[PDB]
């Protein structure tokens, strides 16, 4: 897309509106998204010329995205910017690195992360013409069903994790400032454990939801432009 906005232009426009109203942020984000169209669908096309291999790699990519999204939401993974996610060139599967921020500590950040996972326009465009519908939603539902069926074991494992003395998982002002720079412990652990329990039982806003309903809510929250417009520019929600 040579005639669209450059990534530098989008980044500059996004930083300019940072110290402005939320309406201005939303309108600037919409204008940027108008002149910045996703191109990730070309990743599998240019690498896998054979249609069968192309279809297999695209299916593997979509399944990997669904599984990673559900698991990261369960663990509250944050800081999922473009440089923290890698794609395998041979297998088209996603690998998540830089796992320092987890258990919804990113919501404590100065510019809070309003999305459970990264489901931006490029990520959905990489899934094909159907988008989130089809393979992605069904795989998300399957992963959430498995997570719900194993809530006791998962809760026990996270309990063992959170009380590890050497596990520095809580957010501190120095870490928060380093994450977003521009030119009682028992109480917190119990709160995080109870939030994880609510997630594993399907309770989101005090109402019990089915697996499909919870998946729908997560997808709607992740793809909502209003949430994406509020995010830190380093997250690159337009990409």
């Amino acid at each position: 897309r040579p005639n669209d906005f450059s990534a530098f232009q989008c980044q500059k426009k996004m930083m300019e509106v940072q110290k402005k109203s939320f309406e201005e942020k939303y309108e600037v984000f919409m204008d940027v998204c108008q002149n910045f169209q996703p191109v990730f669908r070309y990743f599998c096309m240019e690498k896998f010329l054979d249609p069968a291999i192309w279809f297999e790699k695209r299916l593997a990519y979509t399944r990997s995205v669904a599984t990673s999204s559900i698991v990261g939401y369960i663990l509250g993974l944050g800081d999922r910017h473009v440089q923290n996610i890698l794609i395998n060139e041979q297998s088209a599967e996603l690998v998540h690195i830089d796992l320092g921020v987890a258990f919804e500590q990113g919501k404590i950040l100065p510019t809070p992360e309003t999305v459970p996972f990264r489901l931006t326009r490029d990520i959905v465009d990489g899934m094909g013409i159907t988008g989130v519908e089809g393979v992605f939603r069904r795989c998300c539902e399957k992963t959430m069903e498995v997570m719900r069926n194993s809530q006791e074991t998962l809760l026990t494992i996270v309990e063992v994790l959170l009380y590890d003395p050497l596990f520095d998982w809580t957010m501190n002002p120095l870490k928060a400032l380093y994450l977003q720079q521009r030119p009682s412990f028992n109480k917190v652990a119990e709160r995080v454990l109870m939030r994880l329990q609510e997630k594993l039982k399907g309770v989101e806003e005090g109402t019990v939801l089915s697996v499909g309903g919870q998946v729908n809510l997560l997808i709607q929250q992740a793809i909502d432009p209003k949430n994406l417009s509020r995010l830190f520019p380093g997250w690159k929600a337009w990409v």
Partner: protein, 120 residues
């Protein structure tokens, strides 16, 4: 639906995560000063937007509850909610004005079941 949105905002404002986020800034404030004042300035904007959104949702919910009460008798019990929103937000001028203008048109017998709670 407006009441649901208002209740969600209220719960978030009284959530323990909100308290943790607020207390983190108070701990951090105690180069360095520039980012500290940046944070203590942005939190004010966020809180103001949240409060204005809550006020809009509350006003819409109260007005639509009054309109529903004026338009039939099947949902009379919801007057309880109309009082619960009104009594907990007596300081809000818009709610009082709406109760004075259109709340007076509501038939008085619908207020009978909670006549104790109003009288107190």
């Amino acid at each position: 639906f407006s009441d649901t949105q208002y209740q969600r905002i209220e719960n978030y404002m009284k959530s323990s995560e909100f308290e943790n986020k607020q207390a983190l800034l108070k701990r951090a404030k105690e180069r360095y000063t520039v980012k500290v004042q940046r944070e203590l300035e942005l939190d004010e904007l966020a809180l103001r937007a949240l409060k204005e959104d809550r006020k809009r949702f509350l006003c819409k919910a109260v007005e639509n509850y009054i309109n529903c009460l004026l338009s039939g008798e099947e949902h009379d019990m919801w007057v309880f909610r109309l009082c619960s929103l009104w009594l907990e937000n007596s300081g809000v001028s818009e709610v009082n004005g709406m109760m004075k203008r259109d709340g007076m048109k509501i038939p008085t017998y619908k207020f009978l079941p909670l006549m104790y709670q109003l009288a107190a």
